Amino acid sequence: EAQVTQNPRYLITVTGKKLTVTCSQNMNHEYMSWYRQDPGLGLRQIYYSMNVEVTDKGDVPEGYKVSRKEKRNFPLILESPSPNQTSLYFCASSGASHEQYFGPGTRLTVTEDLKNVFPPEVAVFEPSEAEISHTQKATLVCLATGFYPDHVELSWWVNGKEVHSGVCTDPQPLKEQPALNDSRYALSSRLRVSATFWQNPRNHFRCQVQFYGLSENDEWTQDRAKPVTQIVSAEAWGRAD
Template sequence: MKPSPFIVFWISVFWIKGVFLNKEKQVFQSPAELLIEPKDETKLTLTHQIQSYDTILWYQRSPGNTSLKLIGYVSYKAVTVESPFQSHFNVSGDGEKAAFLHILSPRHPEDSGEYFGAASMHSSYPAYFGEGTRLTVLEPEHPITEPTVKVLPPSQKECRNQKDNEKRKTLVCVASEFYPDHVSVSWQIGEKEVTDGVATDSAALRNGKYYSITSRLRVSAEVWYEPSNKFICTVSFFINETTKKNSSAFIHGEKAKDTNAMTREKYLRITQSAKLTYSVFIVKSSIYGAFVAFLVWKLQGSSGKQNY
């Protein structure tokens, strides 16, 4: 049973928007991540437990694309592989239970991307996807390289224009010089993992042979200005199906500056204010002195007329 073009189009467009979800955890795909050499052969697996569903389809999404390309499918036990993929892929299994996407040798770096299996029936029923497999075909003579991680402190100027009760500080974690780009980033404050205020790049950026990625953690100024707080950034780097290497970096919070301490700016403000106050005092004193002198002169004048 070859799925209609409507099914293929419907899946490839609307799944990206989150319409087709894993139906009650009855669709399972493995592995989640995979690194292979150009000469390697491997396979992906999709199983489902949806009653009456009889077709499993396999799709490819290339890096930077949002659309899915149909590789092939198995309906009951009948297999079809689309012509552009026949030299690189094969499909096997049973559409009612489990199906496999076989990735054949030789592979090429452009075969890297995301691969999705989906359980389906026909055009009047939705298709339900597995969670996908992220696959990288390693480039020849390019060794797997773990990331270098560092945490940058917040800018000193960040809180200047914020209200006291809204002041926030942003810490930045930078992971760089790694290959390939199978990484995830997490934050801790002390022993506690935090997710609120965390923003991580959606994808690693490649520059030359290597990748880099940044993640930001926003905390209240009160939390940052506590020297006992330890801010830890951990980058989990995928090596193979059983091994992930964690690389971490950290910084401590800093002590808030004493707002009562005498600084040059504060000294200038105080002296300028004192000068202004003294100038006003002198002017007022002069006016008062002139007024007293005027009164004395008037009184002397009145006294002289009486004596005359």
């Protein structure tokens, strides 16, 4: 399980405030590079290091800076962050042969104002009586809406234990307002179980949505609750026929 380590994993910032995403690798690889990934553009190299104190700018380097004082680390510095630096960043290491080891990725969002950050609202919709008589299977639908940025993790928990069998979550969030640059997002997931399971009133279905928002450090002058990193849930209990 050794791998490339990226810290932080998620981050929201105001245009201007400088930031640095570090990247560690304990495999003694001399090669390290940063990549950004955007929809429709794929993976684009930013900078790359062939060895200690060796640095060369990749395809899209404007706005970024790196340093390679140590073999283990290859940080990425953005002096004056901008809205277009909003992206999914990856750090990679290469050693034996020339095989790439990618970090888990960093999701960075540079927003004009922190007043745009909203946590999700989660709701669970119970199985249709129609679907049960016609199919003998019950489908619950979890809806996570109005969150920004698009940084969420959703998961189902039945009777206190996580579930995988019978769930389908959208691969990526939906932009509620495609035409807006600061639009909020939605995500849905499905949990289908036999009609028998659903009819037991002792069964407990809970939808869990982890939001990555502000840190407890960020200032906040608005009235509504500070949109901090947090977990929001929603449940339903089995209903007898």
